[PDB]
């Protein structure tokens, strides 16, 4: 119930669809179920994520975007307080990766 709602809102947000009776919506739902019920993936290991996050930090330092690297390590350090860490991290890490700009305008 809540699972189905989550998958529906995911499709609605990302495909931009507002009609849940669109046949494309039904095809996307069938695709999501068929991808989910086929289990072959590896499960996220924290050590590989740790190697990856320090690698992203070092990559920022080498390209001489120093404040971006400081904010990157800072934001991950603040996130790592209060498993689901590495899930959300691994997700965001593989989804895309770095910009050609700093993309940093936070002034708290």
């Amino acid at each position: 119930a809540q699972q189905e709602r989550d998958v529906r809102e995911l499709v609605r947000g990302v495909a931009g669809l507002q009609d849940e009776a669109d046949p494309n919506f039904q095809l996307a739902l069938n695709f999501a179920w068929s991808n989910f019920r086929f289990h072959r993936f590896l499960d996220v290991n924290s050590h590989k994520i740790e190697k990856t996050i320090e690698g992203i930090y070092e990559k920022f330092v080498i390209h001489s975007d120093l404040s971006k690297a400081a904010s990157w390590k800072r934001l991950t350090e603040e996130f790592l307080n209060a498993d689901a860490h590495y899930s959300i991290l691994s997700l965001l890490l593989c989804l895309s990766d770095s910009p050609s700009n700093s993309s940093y305008v936070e002034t708290p």
Partner: protein, 65 residues
Amino acid sequence: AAAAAANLNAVRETMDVLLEISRILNTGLDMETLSICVRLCEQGINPEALSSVIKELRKATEALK
């Protein structure tokens, strides 16, 4: 309840932390959708499967452009 809503403020605080993390990484995801993803990993899910789902869904909006 009062403590049950300050936890919801706490959820929004980490959601803005992940907002900064999403822009410095240049992802297309917004805040509502990442809360859906957070509920998905509450039930347990491969991030490798969610990324394949979204790596199909975003570049199936570039096929009707």
